[PDB]
Write a protein that binds this DNA or RNA. Structure first.
Ligand SMILES: [Mg+2]
Ligand SMILES: [Mg+2]
Ligand SMILES: [Mg+2]
Ligand SMILES: [Mg+2]
Ligand SMILES: [Mg+2]
Ligand SMILES: [Mg+2]
Ligand SMILES: [Mg+2]
Ligand SMILES: [Mg+2]
Ligand SMILES: [Mg+2]
Ligand SMILES: [Mg+2]
Ligand SMILES: [Mg+2]
Ligand SMILES: [Mg+2]
Lengths: 97, 60, 206, 96, 121, 25, 87, 129, 216
RNA sequence: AGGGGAUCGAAGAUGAUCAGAUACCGUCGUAGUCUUAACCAUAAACUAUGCCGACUAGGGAUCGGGUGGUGUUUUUUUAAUGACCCACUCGGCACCUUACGAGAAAUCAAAGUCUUUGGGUUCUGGGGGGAGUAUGGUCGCAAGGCUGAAACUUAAAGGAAUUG
């Protein structure tokens, strides 16, 4: 039967969502069906900045940050220790871990 | 499948059964008297009421 | 009707107000609660103090009608009710159950804590939902202290109050035993203030 | 409205609707098409007479292993060929 | 493994419930009570009984342990239960009320001292 | 089997029949 | 119910919910019998005499056993305007 | 759209009786509504009911009580003959000692028994029991 | 001996409550079966069928048998109890106990012309239990129980003399065909007839009138 | 049929992989992907829920419009505005809780108001296959679409849940 109510995605009242491509395998997954994981990171690290710290003009300059938005697919997400799998009772929880 | 086979062994066991003939026995009553006879052995007779009122249990 | 002596006297109206009993819940409301009145800004409701008075005497009237004192049962699982439940039950039969409710205390006759109450009292329906449950399974009435967010489901006559209040829970328990004893005959003088202080039925952290 | 029309003057719809769906039945299909007349080697009859042509060694379906000893018969009234079983223990000897 | 079993958890718990004014926090004295105050079929159990007894008796020294109530323990709870201050905390220390309770009492028709201080958004 | 390529087998089949049929016509 | 000549039949004339006026089946365990004492001019209860109220399991399942008694009691006079007819 | 005001009215009456209420609002209160309820109240199933007169079509507020079991409409309104009254009362009544089949005749609206007392027939409107 | 532990079992042992009629009037739950066989000594047990049900395991299947048992005296009362156990003999005893504990009253009326000693049901009654619907239309005199043989016994044991029946769904898997009639034959005291409209003084429950006998 | 032909890319050439590999993977690669003009009429074209109308439980969020409020901010501290806040409302895409209700369960405020069986109306189905085949029409340039059987065959796959 229906495994779930939305049942793949957030498409409710559209029909079409103009899909996107997976970051790992380029699969043409629907955008609202995608598994968006915003990646935010420092430009270098939080541990190796010590070595770079003494080798910089402009003391404590910015330590800029790196941003990303990753679109995985169901096959790619499940395979790599991502949202992979839950219990039937816990699939209702829509809050992030 | 196949439509050929061993037709030469038709009637194997029927023609192989040893011939035992019917023993001579007294006639049973016909018509009303049979209902008289059957009523007697079933209802007013308690011959086979072993656990469940069997009619023809095997000899034991 | 009433002899006008059961009417709420001013010397008890300030106690309800000193315990903040009139303080209701947030803007969140249960439609099964018509006791709300004159909400403040910043989302504060207030319970009509007149209503909770005769709602209180009604509960005692049912309690007094039960012949055997020990057929009354009071249920406490919330933190703010363990001392209140035992103090009320010390002055009446009203046999108390506190701590763990061990579900199956009404059904399952072979359980150690088998009880057949003629009427139960629960402090908070949400925290005592299990106690409310079997009372709907073996034909038992329920008396509950209820705020404006209370689940009035499977609950007989309820007391509009502030279960959040620290003294509101205790005072309503106190006025519960006070009015039960008066009807039974322990307190012949209605005007007598029942010298036992209402501060007795409270909760202490140490 | 449960589907089907309920108007007091919709008997025409109901009768014609029933006619179209009656065809999904199997007995109503064969009866009105007259398939048994046009097919089913008899003529809609229960018995037919024919000439034995040969004997057959038909083998049993699962799960069963045996030979059934049937005969090919060509019918008299229409000339059609059928296969017929010879039921009893050893009765293939009488239908040579 | 050194996790004690039910027959050690329950026999020990049965002792403090009944031998609180009794055998102390020292093992070698406790085990010389158990061998005569209780019929234990095996020495190894008796040694483990006075073991978990000492462990629990060492807990009752600093604060109480929940799950154990010996009748001498709860006098703190049938004396603190009647603990009442003469200050009568429910009395008046000077009562404040918002404008909602101002006309609320007037609707009820009661004469109460109302030092009204407004609290609004 | 799967219905796409049993449906596809039949179309290559129907193509075959119209081809041999039209030779008689 | 009754036969041709008196002789009452149909044992177990059941009770009625005081609010919905429906009847209470034997297996209706979610139903409640409410006895409320009456006190006259003394403030002390009179044991044995009641103002009886019966509620079906239907209203208790819907959480209006409290509300129904608010109107029920007020109509008998043992409450006050706590229930208002106009809404 | 709305085809039968009686179907909408009686459905509202049942759904209030199913939920335990004592009142229901009826819109838009045709003539055959009052005649249907007037029969109903003569048998004690409903009791007091009130006509709110808006200038559009009218409204009806009914005061209910737990006596009623079901009150519906049979659509379409078949012509029933004096001999066919038996079939209707056997199919759609719980028993033959109580319940009434409301059917319109040339002599106004009446139950299946008043039709027999008057020996008149007509079209069928509904049923209450 | 019984030595009951229940408020009702104490009264019933004390003989203070004489008939089940008082039990049904105030909807009193019944917990132990001694209350039934001493207040209604005329109930006869009838085992309908025994069917095995198997659980799948690591290795093999373990087998337990279902035991439907219908009880009731032929005047006014019927009970249906279904219980499964390892052995058929044990399952029969346990299903008997549940059957007695499940006893419900019945309403018997007339098809019309109430001569006396009601022969049929008062109203049309329906009980749906899963796919199956079981309808019980009251019948005229001499019609008997027009019903399937397994259902027929359940209506014989409840004192119904004339009735009609109509079914739907699979009747031929009887565990809940007998629960569809039990609902229907128990819904007899749920339908409000015009001869019950009158308002009663709400008799006080025996637990409150006779509370002086409480064990502690 | 042109224009375009940067990307990717059914066929194919290779390199792999392999026992085989005419597959998955790697490097290329034409028709197409793009467009104008004209055909094609299909999709798991899915909410696998036809449309219209009625009544039946609570809760918050949001979009568009509106209503009221000495509410807040910015302008000219100060007006109007605009943007926010609170309460309510009409319409809409949805979500949360529970079952008095339904269902075969999964579940469902609709899949409820159905043996207590009737608001109006359209379309479709009658064991699984043979078979969307055969045949005859019809539309299309074609691919195919629409319509659509029978003879014959035979007790044998799941909607749903349970235990392993
Ligand atoms: Mg689409
Ligand atoms: Mg018509
Ligand atoms: Mg059938
Ligand atoms: Mg299609
Ligand atoms: Mg579709
Ligand atoms: Mg709709
Ligand atoms: Mg909205
Ligand atoms: Mg929208
Ligand atoms: Mg069919
Ligand atoms: Mg078919
Ligand atoms: Mg088979
Ligand atoms: Mg399955």
């Amino acid at each position: 039967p229906k495994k779930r109510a939305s049942n793949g995605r957030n498409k409710k009242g559209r029909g079409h969502v103009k899909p996107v491509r997976c970051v790992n395998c380029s699969k043409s997954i629907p955008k609202d069906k995608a598994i968006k994981r915003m990646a935010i990171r420092n430009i270098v690290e939080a541990a190796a900045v010590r070595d770079l710290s003494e080798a910089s003009v402009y003391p404590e300059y910015a330590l800029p940050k790196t941003y990303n938005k990753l679109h995985y697919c169901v096959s790619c997400a499940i395979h790599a220790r991502i949202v992979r799998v839950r219990s039937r009772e816990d699939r209702k929880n829509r809050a992030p871990p | 499948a196949k439509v050929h086979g061993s037709l030469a062994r038709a009637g194997k066991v029927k023609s192989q059964t040893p011939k035992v003939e019917k023993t001579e026995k007294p006639k049973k009553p016909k018509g009303r008297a049979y209902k008289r006879l059957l009523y007697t052995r079933r209802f007013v007779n308690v011959t086979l009421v072993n656990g469940k009122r069997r009619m023809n249990p095997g000899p034991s | 009707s009433l002899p006008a002596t059961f009417d709420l006297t001013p010397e008890d109206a300030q106690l309800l107000l000193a315990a903040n009993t009139h303080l209701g819940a947030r803007n969140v409301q249960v439609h099964q609660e018509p006791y709300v009145f004159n909400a403040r800004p910043d989302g504060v409701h207030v319970i009509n103090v007149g209503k909770t008075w005769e709602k209180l005497v009604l509960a005692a009237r049912i309690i007094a009608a039960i012949p055997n004192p020990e057929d009354v049962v009071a249920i406490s699982s919330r933190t703010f009710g363990q001392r209140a439940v035992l103090k009320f039950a010390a002055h009446t039969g009203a046999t108390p159950i506190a701590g763990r409710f061990t579900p199956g205390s009404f059904t399952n006759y072979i359980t150690r804590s088998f009880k057949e109450p003629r009427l139960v009292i629960v402090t908070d329906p949400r925290s005592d939902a299990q106690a409310i449950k079997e009372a709907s399974y073996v034909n038992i009435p329920v008396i509950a202290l209820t705020d404006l967010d209370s689940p009035s489901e499977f609950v007989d006559v309820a007391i509009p109050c502030n279960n959040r209040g620290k003294h509101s829970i205790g005072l309503i328990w106190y006025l519960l035993a006070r009015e039960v004893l008066r009807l039974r005959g322990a307190l012949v003088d209605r005007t007598q203030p029942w010298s036992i202080m209402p501060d007795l039925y409270f909760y202490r952290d140490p | 409205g449960k589907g089907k029309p309920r108007g007091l003057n919709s008997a025409r719809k109901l009768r014609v609707h029933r006619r179209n769906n009656r065809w999904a039945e199997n007995n109503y299909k064969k009866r009105l098409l007259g398939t048994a007349f046009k097919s089913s080697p008899f003529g809609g009859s229960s018995h037919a007479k024919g000439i034995v042509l040969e004997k057959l060694g038909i083998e049993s379906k699962q799960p069963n292993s045996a030979i059934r000893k049937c005969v090919r018969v060509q019918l008299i009234k229409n000339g059609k060929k059928v296969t017929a079983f010879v039921p009893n223990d050893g009765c293939l000897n009488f239908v040579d | 493994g050194r996790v004690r079993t039910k027959t050690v958890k329950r026999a020990s718990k049965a002792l403090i419930e009944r031998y609180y004014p009794k055998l102390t926090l020292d093992f070698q004295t406790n085990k010389r009570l158990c061998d005569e105050i209780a019929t234990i079929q095996s020495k190894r159990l008796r040694n483990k009984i006075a073991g978990y007894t000492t462990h629990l008796m060492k807990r009752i020294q600093k604060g109480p342990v929940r799950g154990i109530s010996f009748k001498l323990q709860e006098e703190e709870r049938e004396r603190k239960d009647q603990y009442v201050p003469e200050v009568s905390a429910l009395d008046l220390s000077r009562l404040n009320v918002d404008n909602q309770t101002s006309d609320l009492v007037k609707s009820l028709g009661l004469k109460l001292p109302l030092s009204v201080i407004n609290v609004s958004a | 089997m799967r219905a796409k390529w049993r449906k596809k087998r039949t179309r290559r089949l129907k193509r075959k029949r119209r081809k041999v049929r039209a030779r008689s016509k | 119910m009754e036969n041709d000549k008196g002789q009452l039949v149909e044992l177990y004339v059941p009770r009625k919910c005081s609010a919905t006026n429906r009847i209470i089946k034997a297996d209706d365990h979610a139903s409640v019998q409410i006895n409320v004492a009456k006190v006259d001019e003394e403030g002390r209860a009179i044991p044995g005499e009641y103002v009886t109220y019966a509620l079906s399991g239907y209203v208790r399942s819907r959480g209006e056993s409290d509300d129904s008694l608010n109107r029920l009691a007020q109509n008998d006079g043992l409450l006050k305007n706590v229930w208002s007819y106009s809404r | 759209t709305r085809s039968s005001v009686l179907a909408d009215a009686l459905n509202a009456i049942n759904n209030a009786e199913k939920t335990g209420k004592r009142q229901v609002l009826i819109r838009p209160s045709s003539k055959v509504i009052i005649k249907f309820l007037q029969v109903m109240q003569k048998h004690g199933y409903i009791g007091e009911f009130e006509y709110i007169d808006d200038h559009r079509s009218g409204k009806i507020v009914v005061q209910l009580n737990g006596r009623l079991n079901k009150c519906g409409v049979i659509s379409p309104r078949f012509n029933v003959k004096i001999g066919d009254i038996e079939k209707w009362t056997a199919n759609l009544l719980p028993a033959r000692q109580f319940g009434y089949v409301i059917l319109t005749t040339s002599a106004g609206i009446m139950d299946h028994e008043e039709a027999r007392r008057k020996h008149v027939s007509g079209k069928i409107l509904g049923f209450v029991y | 001996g019984w030595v009951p532990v229940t408020k009702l079992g104490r009264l019933v042992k004390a003989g203070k409550i004489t008939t089940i009629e008082e039990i049904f009037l105030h909807s009193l739950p019944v917990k132990e079966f001694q209350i039934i066989d001493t207040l209604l000594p005329g109930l006869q047990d009838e085992v309908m069928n025994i069917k095995p049900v198997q659980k799948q395991t690591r290795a093999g299947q373990r087998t337990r048998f279902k035991a439907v048992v219908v009880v009731g005296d032929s005047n006014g009362h019927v009970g249906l109890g279904i219980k499964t156990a390892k052995e058929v003999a044990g399952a029969i005893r346990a299903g008997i106990i549940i059957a007695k504990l499940s006893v419900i009253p019945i309403r018997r009326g007339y098809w019309g012309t109430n001569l006396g000693q009601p022969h049929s049901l008062a109203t049309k009654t329906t009980g749906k239990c899963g796919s199956v619907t079981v309808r019980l239309i009251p019948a005229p005199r001499g019609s008997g129980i027009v019903a399937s043989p397994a259902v027929k016994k359940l209506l014989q044991l409840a004192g119904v003399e004339d009735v009609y029946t109509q079914s739907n769904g699979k009747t031929r898997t009887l565990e809940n065909t007998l629960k569809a009639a039990f609902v229907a034959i128990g819904n007899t005291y749920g339908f409000l007839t015009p001869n019950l409209w009158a308002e009663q003084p709400l008799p006080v429950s025996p637990l409150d009138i006779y509370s002086d006998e409480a064990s502690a």
